[PDB]
Amino acid sequence: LSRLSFIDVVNDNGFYQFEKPKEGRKYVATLDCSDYHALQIIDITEFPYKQVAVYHSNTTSHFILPDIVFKYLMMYNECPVYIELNSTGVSIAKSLAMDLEYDNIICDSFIDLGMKQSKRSKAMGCSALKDLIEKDKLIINHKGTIQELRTFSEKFHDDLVMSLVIFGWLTTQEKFAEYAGK
Numbered sequence: 001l002s003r004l005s006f007i008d009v010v011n012d013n014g015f016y017q018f019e020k021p022k023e024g025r026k027y028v029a030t031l032d033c034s035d036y037h038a039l040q041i042i043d044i045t046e047f048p049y050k051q052v053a054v055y056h057s058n059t060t061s062h063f064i065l066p067d068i069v070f071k072y073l074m075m076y077n078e079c080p081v082y083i084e085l086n087s088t089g090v091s092i093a094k095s096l097a098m099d100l101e102y103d104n105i106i107c108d109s110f111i112d113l114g115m116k117q118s119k120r121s122k123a124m125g126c127s128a129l130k131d132l133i134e135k136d137k138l139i140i141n142h143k144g145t146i147q148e149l150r151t152f153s154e155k156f157h158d159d160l161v162m163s164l165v166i167f168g169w170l171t172t173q174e175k176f177a178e179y180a181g182k
């Protein structure tokens with residue numbers, strides 16, 4: 001843990017940015033919705049991964065969120081998004097697809113537009129995260145995230161960590177191959 005430091009970037013209206021988009025780099029975004037909404041944008045290129053932007057808020061209406069997500073996803077090279085399918089993720093993921101006609105959505109199946117909930121995935125995901133940070137394979141820069149990585153037990157908020165767990169689960173998958181690499 002505690003070898004973790006953060007860059008104290010200003011909270012630009014919910015959106016935290018540590019690196020702006022650089023052509024040639026391939027990003028990936030995971031979302032845990034409405035507790036705050038937490039949008040993690042990671043750089044999966046060089047197997048040094050980097051958390052370049054974070055969207056954090058417990059005050060945006062899930063009604064308008066897709067617009068917010070859309071903005072940042074487009075901003076980072078038509079970025080792929082992996083939405084956890086809780087009661088709200090389902091609606092958000094649909095808007096993102098129908099309403100905003102965004103096509104770079106990662107799906108679990110044609111019916112589930114993101115990560116389908118399961119005790120199995122969360123667990124499996126946590127583990128995958130634990131070995132991404134500890135091996136210094138995932139570089140975190142956000143203050144909140146780091147604070148939650150200090151009040152989140154193996155078994156108070158955790159949205160920013162959950163968000164990074166969606167990312168874990170996404171790394172235990174095969175499809176992750178393509179999206180990866182510059």
Ligand SMILES: [Mg+2]
Nearest residue numbers: 033034035159
């Ligand atoms: Mg949440």
